[PDB]
Write a protein that binds this DNA or RNA. Structure first.
Lengths: 18, 70, 55, 628
RNA sequence: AAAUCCUUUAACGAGGAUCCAUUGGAGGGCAAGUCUGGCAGCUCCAAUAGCGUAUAUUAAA
RNA sequence: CAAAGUCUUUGGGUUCCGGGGGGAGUAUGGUUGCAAAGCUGAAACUUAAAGGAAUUGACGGAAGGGCACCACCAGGAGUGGA
């Protein structure tokens, strides 16, 4: 509420795990 | 890696930011350093100051007087 | 561990060259380097101001 | 450890290396090689290349032609060798860059009285930056002068070319026996194995036929008959033509060689279960009316104007690092909403899986890039797939091309066709390290719409330019810095390195002018770009280690919003802000050193930035290039 | 041999942004900056149409 | 130091033996020994010092003295509690 926020980890790209 | 015997070698690139000039799998004229095989004062176990990168030198690439074929 | 690559090269304020005239090249440089040292010399009590006496 | 046994070791090493070299020489040109292909580029205007090619033409010729261009086959059993010449005009940037990326020996023809020409200089810098297969110089007017001007003309040539080509001899062409000497030369030459081409399989297009599905569809079977010069081209894999996008093919077949070294059957089908298919993106979608709150709490030329404003902003962002004049009316915490300060730019963390846009739902991120690349190149190298080998004169019936491709080939534009390795048609986030040629001095901003040649592709795009460090956070650049090497970043198809990175810009009406050139770094969206903003100030009250600074904000609680973010100072001092005082922008700040009156107190603010989504594949047809 | 170059000579050919001199260095050995900006400029040094760097080898040993 | 002298003013005979410090008296081989081990004896690599004599000033967690109720003792007034 001043210099911080939520911004959680949601929705990524298709990772082709080796 | 060298060509002429198959020995693998650690070699050194002299100037700043000149590692950006070299990409993997490119013909590099590796030259040695000056204390006949001993390491340099700061760097452990590194023998050889690379001069040429694909038939041009680093002293031209570091001054920009030529361009690098590939 | 490859930390950084070329940080000090391209991040100077890239000051280009000013304009001058040429040096005398060949013999006339030796005439100058003789006359600048041993003809219009100032008698000096300790000889502390060198050829690049820059403050 | 003896006189004899170590000479024996020398003998074994000579046998090994000569066996390797005779392995790699016979399989290029001849009774196994497709042909040996030579492209021909003159530089000046005085070169009459019909006279050149008719000196050069003879053995046995087999004369093809096109609508404008005129390529042909050449065969001599005397040397047991196939040449395939193909002539080009410099400046025709589309044609030359499309068929010198699949050429195999470049022959530069030169005028006698000077070296390059400017159109040839342009094409020469382009061909330098996308990789020379093999150059071999030549001249034409040396016999027309007796010995005096002949010798001095050759000396002027070797002085005017050794500032670009540092060491080569000028094989002159006056007689057809000079053409014989030139052909004996080009037969035996060390081919620079271009590392991009050998890791795939690519056909040239010697002949093109077309059968539409329906003619009003303007889609139909394309028929490319030509040789195979890369790896073993597999049939389940895809295919790309360099001018007209990427598209999946139906039938491979092997008709006979029309032109041997000396004088309908198919081997494979499609089946679509194993055949990879066209998924370009992710295929899944009681207060009084009087009193205040106080007592209630007690209760044409516009383009040149744009150019000159760009030169103004390059002055104001190159005399200065990233200085930003402050807003005045909008609340300065709102317009700088998603900004947060780092204590140290190198060290303090930043979550790469935090603020991903709605367009990051439409990319394929590799988990381990290097080992996936090693696995794909390992299956390329030591395996054999079921498709046709090298040298095979094959035709491909491609299911889904349009007709204007065929018409552009009937003009004389060359078609190529290289297959893709697994995961090379899907879109992801590409990172190109790149520098600027001193041919163009035009400003190049961040989201300029440019044209890329990242590894046999051709596409308009919109990058973001960056510092090139091997750290986590990389800074956004706001202009293309004229001497550093930067990193552009774009939503684009994914391509395995190495690959050359050409960039050029529309001057006016198809005058593609070259700006940028480089190679392909690691391709992954994880490399997040950090855009910085410097907010300025002035220290108008100066005490011992504590100072009151204005002109950095204009509210009061802006300072309550940007409170933990540390200041810094051009004289090196590293302080951070205490309470604000004014209702206007004013604050007291603690410091470590004493503050000069000639100071500029300034803080830094950061966000994550990422490129825009433009992958329009079509590139407009270039015009002949000329001098500015 | 026949030439070219060299020599001898007619004609044109010099105002300094030209008919333009580079290569290394400036803490010590070791010659020459506590100059200015964030490696560059300017000045200076040694040699000079040559100077670096690597390697073998010799003197210093 | 009466030899550690007669040594750049460098030659009385003659044996062993040292060439920066580590790696190392390790390897490995030969040899002796019942054995432990002894004798001879590397190199790869690493490091700008390791060492030998002599020679001086701060801190003492070193010791002695000497002073002071901006120290103590004997005590007073207290403050610190509201």
């Amino acid at each position: 509420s001043i210099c911080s926020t939520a911004s959680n980890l949601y929705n990524h790209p298709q990772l082709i795990k080796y | 890696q060298l060509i002429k015997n198959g020995k693998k070698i650690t070699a050194f690139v002299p100037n700043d930011g000149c590692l950006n000039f070299i990409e993997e799998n490119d013909e590099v004229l590796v030259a040695g350093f000056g204390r006949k095989g001993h390491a340099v004062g700061d760097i452990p176990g590194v023998r050889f100051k690379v001069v040429k990168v694909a038939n041009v030198s680093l002293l031209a690439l570091y001054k920009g007087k030529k361009e690098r074929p590939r | 561990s490859l930390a950084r690559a070329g940080k000090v090269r391209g991040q100077t304020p890239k000051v280009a060259k000013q304009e001058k005239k040429k040096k005398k090249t060949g013999r006339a440089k030796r005439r100058m380097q003789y006359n600048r040292r041993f003809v219009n010399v100032v008698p000096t009590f300790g000889k502390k101001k060198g050829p690049n006496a820059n403050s | 450890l003896s006189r004899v046994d170590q000479r024996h070791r020398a003998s074994q090493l000579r046998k090994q290396k000569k066996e390797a070299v005779l392995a790699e020489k016979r399989q290029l040109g001849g009774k196994d090689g497709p042909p040996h292909q030579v492209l021909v580029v003159p530089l000046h205007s005085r070169i009459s290349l019909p006279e050149a090619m008719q000196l050069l033409q003879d053995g046995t010729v087999h004369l093809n032609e096109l609508g404008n261009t005129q390529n042909f086959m050449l065969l001599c059993p005397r040397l047991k060798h196939r040449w395939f010449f193909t002539s080009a005009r410099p400046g025709d940037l589309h044609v030359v860059l499309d068929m010198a990326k699949v050429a195999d020996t470049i022959l530069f023809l030169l005028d006698p009285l000077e070296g390059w020409d400017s159109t040839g200089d342009y094409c020469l810098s382009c061909l330098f930056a996308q990789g020379l297969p093999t150059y071999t110089l030549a001249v034409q007017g040396i016999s027309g002068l007796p010995l005096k001007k002949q010798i001095d003309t050759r000396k002027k040539l070797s002085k005017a070319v050794e500032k670009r080509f540092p060491h080569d001899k000028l094989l002159l062409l006056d007689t057809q026996q000079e053409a014989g000497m030139l052909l004996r030369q080009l037969a035996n030459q060390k081919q620079q194995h271009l590392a991009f081409r050998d890791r795939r399989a690519y056909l040239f297009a010697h002949a093109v036929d077309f059968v539409p599905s329906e003619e009003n569809n303007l889609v139909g079977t394309l028929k490319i008959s030509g040789y195979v010069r890369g790896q073993t081209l597999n049939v389940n894999r895809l295919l790309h033509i360099v001018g007209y996008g990427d598209f999946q093919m139906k039938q491979i077949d092997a008709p006979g060689d029309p032109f041997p070294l000396n004088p309908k059957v198919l081997m494979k089908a499609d089946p679509g279960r194993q055949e990879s298919l066209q998924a370009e993106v992710i295929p899944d979608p009681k207060v009084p009316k009087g009193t205040s709150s106080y007592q209630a709490e007690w209760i044409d030329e516009e383009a040149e104007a744009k150019m000159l404003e760009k030169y103004k902003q390059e002055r104001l962002e190159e005399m200065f690092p990233d200085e930003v004049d402050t807003p005045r009316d909008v609340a300065a915490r709102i317009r700088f909403q998603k900004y947060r300060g780092l204590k140290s730019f190198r060290t303090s963390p930043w979550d790469p899986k935090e603020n991903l846009p709605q367009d990051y739902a439409r990319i394929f991120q590799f988990q381990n890039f290097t080992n996936t690349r090693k696995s794909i190149f390992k299956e390329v190298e030591e395996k054999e797939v079921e498709g046709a080998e090298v040298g095979w004169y094959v035709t491909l019936h491609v299911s889904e091309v349009p007709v204007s491709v065929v018409e552009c080939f009937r003009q004389g534009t060359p078609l190529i066709a290289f297959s893709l390795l697994p995961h090379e048609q899907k879109m992801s986030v590409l990172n190109m390290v790149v520098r600027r040629d001193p041919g163009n001095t035009e400003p190049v901003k961040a989201k300029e719409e440019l044209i890329f040649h990242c590894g046999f592709r051709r596409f308009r795009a919109s990058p973001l330019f960056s510092q090139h460090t091997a750290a986590d956070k990389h800074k956004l650049q706001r202009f293309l810095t004229a001497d550093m090497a930067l990193v552009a970043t774009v939503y684009a198809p994914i391509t395995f390195p190495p690959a050359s990175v050409l960039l050029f810009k529309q001057k006016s009406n198809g005058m593609h002018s070259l700006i940028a050139t480089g190679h392909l770094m690691s391709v992954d969206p994880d490399r997040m770009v950090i855009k910085r903003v410097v907010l300025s100030g002035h220290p108008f009250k100066i005490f011992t280690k504590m100072a009151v600074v204005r002109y950095m904000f204009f509210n009061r609680e802006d300072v309550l919003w940007f409170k933990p973010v540390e200041l810094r100072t051009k004289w090196g001092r590293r302080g951070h802000i205490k309470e604000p005082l004014g209702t206007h922008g004013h604050m007291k700040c603690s410091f470590d050193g004493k503050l000069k009156s000639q100071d500029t107190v300034l803080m830094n603010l950061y966000k994550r930035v990422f490129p825009k989504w433009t992958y329009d594949p079509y590139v407009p047809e270039p015009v002949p290039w000329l001098k500015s």
